[PDB]
Design a protein around this ligand. Structure first.
Ligand SMILES: CCCCCCCCCCCCCC(=O)O
Length: 134
C-alpha cells in the first residue's frame, strides 16, 4: 500500500476558509457551528493492515471512522448525520463521499508542499482547511 502513504500521520489545523457556510449548508445548528468554528482539530490518519482509521480530536469533539478503501460504510458524523461513506484515492487525492437523505457532500484531501489541504464541498459551497504535519 503506497498510495495512502503521504496522508499517514498526525495533522493539526492551521487555517480555515468559509467553514461557517459549509456547515450552514450541511444543516449544523448555529450553536454547534461555533463549537466547530473556533477550534483547531488534530486529525490522525493511520492504517492497521486492511483497515484505515481517521480520528478527529477537539476541545469538544473526539470522533473517528474506520474503513476499507472503496468499501461503503455507515458513519455518524460529528453533527449527527447518519450517512453512507465511501473513501477512495484518486489522482493523489483522498476522496470521502457522504450520502444521506438524497443529499451528498465530499471531503477531498491532498498533500501540497507537505501540508494537507482539505476541500469540503456541498452544493457549490466550498470550505478549504489546511493542516500541518505534527
Ligand atoms: C461536534 C461539533 C459539530 C461539528 C460539525 C461539523 C463537522 C461536519 C463535517 C466536518 C468535516 C471537516 C473535515 C476536516 O477538516 O478534516
Amino acid at each position: 500500500s503506497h498510495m495512502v502513504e503521504p496522508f499517514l500521520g498526525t495533522w493539526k489545523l492551521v487555517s480555515s476558509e468559509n467553514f461557517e457556510d459549509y456547515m450552514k449548508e450541511l444543516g449544523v445548528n448555529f450553536a454547534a457551528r461555533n463549537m466547530a468554528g473556533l477550534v483547531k482539530p488534530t486529525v490522525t490518519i493511520s492504517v492497521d493492515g486492511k483497515m484505515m482509521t481517521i480520528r478527529t480530536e477537539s476541545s469538544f469533539q473526539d470522533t473517528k471512522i474506520s474503513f476499507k478503501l472503496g468499501e461503503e460504510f455507515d458513519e455518524t458524523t460529528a453533527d449527527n448525520r447518519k450517512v453512507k461513506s465511501t473513501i477512495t484515492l484518486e489522482n493523489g487525492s483522498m476522496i470521502h463521499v457522504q450520502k444521506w437523505l438524497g443529499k451528498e457532500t465530499t471531503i477531498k484531501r491532498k498533500i501540497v508542499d507537505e501540508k494537507m489541504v482539505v476541500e469540503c464541498k456541498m452544493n457549490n459551497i466550498v470550505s478549504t482547511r489546511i493542516y500541518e504535519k505534527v
